[PDB]
Nucleic acid binder design. Sequence first.
RNA 1: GACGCAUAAAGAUGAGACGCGUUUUAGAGCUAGAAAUAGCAAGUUAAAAUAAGGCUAGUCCGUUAUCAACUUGAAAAAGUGGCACCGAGUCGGUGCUU
DNA 2: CGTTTGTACTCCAGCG
DNA 3: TCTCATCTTTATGCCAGAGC
DNA 4: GCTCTGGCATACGCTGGAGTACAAACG
Length: 1354
Amino acid sequence: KKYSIGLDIGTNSVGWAVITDEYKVPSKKFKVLGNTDRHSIKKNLIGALLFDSGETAEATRLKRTARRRYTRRKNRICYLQEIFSNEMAKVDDSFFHRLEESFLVEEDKKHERHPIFGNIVDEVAYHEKYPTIYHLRKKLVDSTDKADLRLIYLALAHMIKFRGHFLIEGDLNPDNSDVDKLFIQLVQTYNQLFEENPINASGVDAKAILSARLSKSRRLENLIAQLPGEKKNGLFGNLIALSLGLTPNFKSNFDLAEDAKLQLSKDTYDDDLDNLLAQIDLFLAAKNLSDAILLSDILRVNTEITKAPLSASMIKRYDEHHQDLTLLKALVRQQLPEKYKEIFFDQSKNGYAGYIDGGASQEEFYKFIKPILEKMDGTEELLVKLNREDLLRKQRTFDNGSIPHQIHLGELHAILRRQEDFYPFLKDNREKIEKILTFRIPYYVGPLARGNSRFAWMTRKSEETITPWNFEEVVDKGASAQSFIERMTNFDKNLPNEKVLPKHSLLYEYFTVYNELTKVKYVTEGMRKPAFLSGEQKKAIVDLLFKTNRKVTVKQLKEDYFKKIECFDSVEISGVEDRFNASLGTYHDLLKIIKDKDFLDNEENEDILEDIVLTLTLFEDREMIEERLKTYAHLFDDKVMKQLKRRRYTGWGRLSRKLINGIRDKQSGKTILDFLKSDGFANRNFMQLIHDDSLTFKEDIQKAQDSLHEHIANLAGSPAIKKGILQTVKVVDELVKVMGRHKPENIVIEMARENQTTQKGQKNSRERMKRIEEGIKELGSQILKEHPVENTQLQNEKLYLYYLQNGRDMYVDQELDINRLSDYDVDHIVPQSFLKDDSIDNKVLTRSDKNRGKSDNVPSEEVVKKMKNYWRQLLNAKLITQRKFDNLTKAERGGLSELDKAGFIKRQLVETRQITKHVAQILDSRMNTKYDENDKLIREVKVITLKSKLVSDFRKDFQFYKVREINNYHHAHDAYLNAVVGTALIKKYPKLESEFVYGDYKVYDVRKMIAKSEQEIGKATAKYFFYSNIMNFFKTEITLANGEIRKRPLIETNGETGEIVWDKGRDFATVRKVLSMPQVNIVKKTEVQTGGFSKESILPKRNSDKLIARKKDWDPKKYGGFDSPTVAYSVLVVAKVEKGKSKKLKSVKELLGITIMERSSFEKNPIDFLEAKGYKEVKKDLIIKLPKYSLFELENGRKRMLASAGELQKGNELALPSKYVNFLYLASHYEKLKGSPEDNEQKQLFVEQHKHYLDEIIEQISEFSKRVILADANLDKVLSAYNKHRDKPIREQAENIIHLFTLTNLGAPAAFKYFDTTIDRKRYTSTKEVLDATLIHQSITGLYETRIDLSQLG
RNA sequence: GACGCAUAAAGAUGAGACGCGUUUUAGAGCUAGAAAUAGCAAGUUAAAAUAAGGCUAGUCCGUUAUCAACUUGAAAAAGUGGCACCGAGUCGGUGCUU
DNA sequence: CGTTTGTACTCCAGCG
DNA sequence: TCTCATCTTTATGCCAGAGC
DNA sequence: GCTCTGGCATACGCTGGAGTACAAACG
Ligand SMILES: [Mg+2]
Ligand SMILES: [Mg+2]
Ligand SMILES: [Mg+2]
Ligand SMILES: [Mg+2]
Ligand SMILES: [Mg+2]
């Protein structure tokens, strides 16, 4: 009557099993409902629920943000049109109407078919005058003639619609820049300020640096060569301050007006200018030379007087494209006339015709045309431009993403300045148009909702509609920025109504320090035993060396404190290894700013400091920080406040202020922090304080603490794990309902946790700074010398990848820029679209235009061959792992293939861990509910949490081998073995319940301490060995390294009680028998499909009924549209259809797929929807919703799952005998058995003896296929391939036979191969047969069934 | 030693932006041609849409999570299916029992 | 003799 | 692809009396 | 004034839609 439940939870499965006290799996006769004649089923209480993994909300988020961007871009254009509308009605009242309907075909257009001018001659003239929009933009920027209002609008709308990025702050003005020759003005101003005969007659200016790769190196070299200045500052020192960042932390080179340091023109650079403004403008030349150099870096146009450098560069692209195209056409005609049509007319090839009119990108076009160019004559210039990626370029390409918005804003401002003379309305609202271009909702404001958004947090000062021009006066930006962070930070778990403290708050730092400090012990020569630090000693230590050293080493503690004050000549410290992990970093940072130490040490102003740190953590906008800190301006100097607003903290703690310093124990009146600072002689740390029954902290925490669906929905984190959590809780609930509504004795959950040796865990958690040091020193570069870095700074992804690559690009042999890292981007070696892998082995820092031409593919063979030596250098120095090197060189081993797809992603382990950890506490809360006064909670049900290592060792030791490829039974079997091993362990060692049973621990149970011996190897190694040896009571012979063996008893008893725990004779037979049960309740969860309506690709117009209109009024036969709609669910319709040459009502039964788009339309009124679909006399009461994976049973027990309205998945399981599974496991893995050499030899001999099982397994597969798969051609191919390779080695034959189970695997048909022969999918693309099958409705465990015989519907 | 701290791996959630891509239309094709076609010219750009759409009409929302069947119900939610034994090719049989 | 469903094979899927 | 912010799981290191 | 958890010894899963060609197969 007592029973246990095992669980094997995964991302797409939850295996479950019910066991009794004798480890047997029971079986019950279950009632089956429905109209069939079958009334009872015998079923074993073991099975697995399979489901589609919950998707992360990332793709939905990306779609939502893209939708918002499109909405706001349309709104920008609407604002511009509203500005232009009144004065456009003068010149062309239908202009904006023609712009709106430009998409429509001519018979749909209500106006003239030429959008801009509305007549053929003017339109042709315009396009001859301005072949590209950039011609018009440059003409409007440069010319003084009154232009047409329509042309002005077109240029401004092009700038506003495609307005460039906002990755650069400040005003990158073009008017006071773009001429690098103003360096002469820089040396002129230097000559004015520097009177000791400075250098003025220099050589060539920085144009040489620009013509080379831009860095500190070429700048220094060219300035040394051309500018032999009288001092370092003039020749090199000041120029970089106008063009580059400075690495050293020391003050700048020899002073010119003041001695302080120098930095590039950043956000804080203006305030840093006190070294000259308070001493004198030489530094004003930064705002000119810096912008000139930067825009010369962005754009390859500096030789022209134009005020539109971007439009000029695009016109140069156009001109070079034209010239190169003419030359290429001439060369092709005079050398390769037969190839002319292919290159220039056939747009299915990747020639120029496919480059312009086809789908060929310029990488495809270049790889097509490079062989052509190489074999002709006179193509040297074209080839050079090709290798430089500037051959026949388009004006709108992937690499335009580096254009800042300031360039477009400059062109727009120039146009408005030019044309405001003639159009007064342009002068009145020049700033409105500029604001339309430049306005951008702050990231901390979010969507500008008015109540009906679940993603919005913005608060508004007034009810006015928000525009770009009243955004400041309508949106409360301070409160919005506060709620931006406040809605994302955690609440204190102990006090769930109190927000956690900032990670860098002073109370949090003190709490951490004293929590670590309260447990360190010292022993002297004369002291009997190690003693705690007293409250006075902890006070003294903190004041002496925690408030004077940022990092406190044990050496400092035993030399600065103990030796010097309260003298001990030699002391031993326990409770810290080499350095206190705790620190007071915020104290030192605020001591640097506020030189007053007494202010920080004072206790009255603790609230002020907490508020200051909270402000510095919530906001990064210097204006908001200044406004918030302004209330304290009477406590600090103006300079001190200027320094505070620079200080920026991020990160939040785990505990609230009310917890660590707010609540008081009613007896002693002490807070938790007061106890940490002085707790008599007990010196309780944080976890002891909140768990003592003698103190009221535990009571206050406990008293400060619906439905299952609501509870799972309200869980924080990814919604991906909610699916697994809810499904396993529902499985447990159904299993409890089956077993007479009696709660299980135990629930055993397989956890993905692991015990590691201390060496492995210390090597896998080593600091990344250490990794960079050890790698750089190996290859000998001075990258750390040039750019010193700390481990904390390496949390930045791009900064970390910079040093991992030795400061070099991994795709082009070029050096990266540290200060300009935002203009590089992180590239996923194996593309995101293929496989989800965000690991460091997959990430590479490369240049933006290198990434964006390298689209959704591994690096090309050209890149691999160029870079294989540098990658080899990095691999030998261990900055990239072997897996990273394999990812980079993927093109050398055949590129992307389904083999790469066949491997668990790393997110799956994290998802499994999260699901299992959540469900452990969910089940512990739902099962154990009866509270008791003597002991708080009554543990009716023990939720055992087994590590996966135990069951895997059980399988491998006792030959219960697992092969995931044969069938889905391994989930249920893993659950069964989990139940067996967990219950056996709890019975044999009832004193391990504190660590295996969820929540049954007492804090710091010293009873389970490890002696000093066996700790010299490491505390985690001792636990690793303990857990390894804790499972030896299952085995009989325990073999030693020297050959001695202990024979364990055949019956294992509890030891103290004497209850039988494991009869090694009969219980192993019980386990073996259960793993050979052919009936296992494998159920695939039926799921109504949700997601995208169809495939996202817009297809060209086609006379087909599969196309879907992409707007309501756009006929897809004229405009194109989407196809491949996703079927939400199918419906079984029984009705009459008018068909035949003479249409007549023939009664029909069939499945109609209700796609996601039309799901709501169908659910509003099914009869109207079906009649409009063409069904007459629909029987409303016979409509059956059939979601995906609906199960039908046919003759000979053949089962099919509904993939869609016109496809079926195979729905049977191959219960292969356990002997064949073991033989497949042993024959494969032939030399990687990992056992003793004698055992490996014995297993190899067994495999060799039983080589006849290959024929037996093939017979199993063939009969199973002939019965349920019915893929006769594929089966014949499989049999022929097996007969061909029957003389291959047993290992290879067994390895390839495991692929054959892809033929029989439940689910969608998949392709597989047998040593070379690829067997492709036999898809069941007809759902006519299931219309007379038996529709199976299965409960969550599949034990409860309803069988509907569809042959009786008609 | 399930809290906390330090380190690290692997992931997650939300907001703000960029650049492409696709689709239809505009960018007068010319000559020889009954013409089917052939020769030549040309190409780089733009508008609009970018889940159909929705109503609470916001510069908002629309692809995550929730879903066996049946009976109750405005819905959350509740309720529905006997046991033991011998066996095992996807569960069968036997015997008690309602 | 003309449609009309089964097989069978190929291709494709927005992205950086 | 970029910027900003927050959060989770797991591993290792430090943290362990006490009644008989 | 001490052994205790134990025995005494260690290195997580994966395809449906659409088109085209061709052959039975019904009307
Ligand atoms: Mg598992
Ligand atoms: Mg990429
Ligand atoms: Mg599993
Ligand atoms: Mg879904
Ligand atoms: Mg821990």
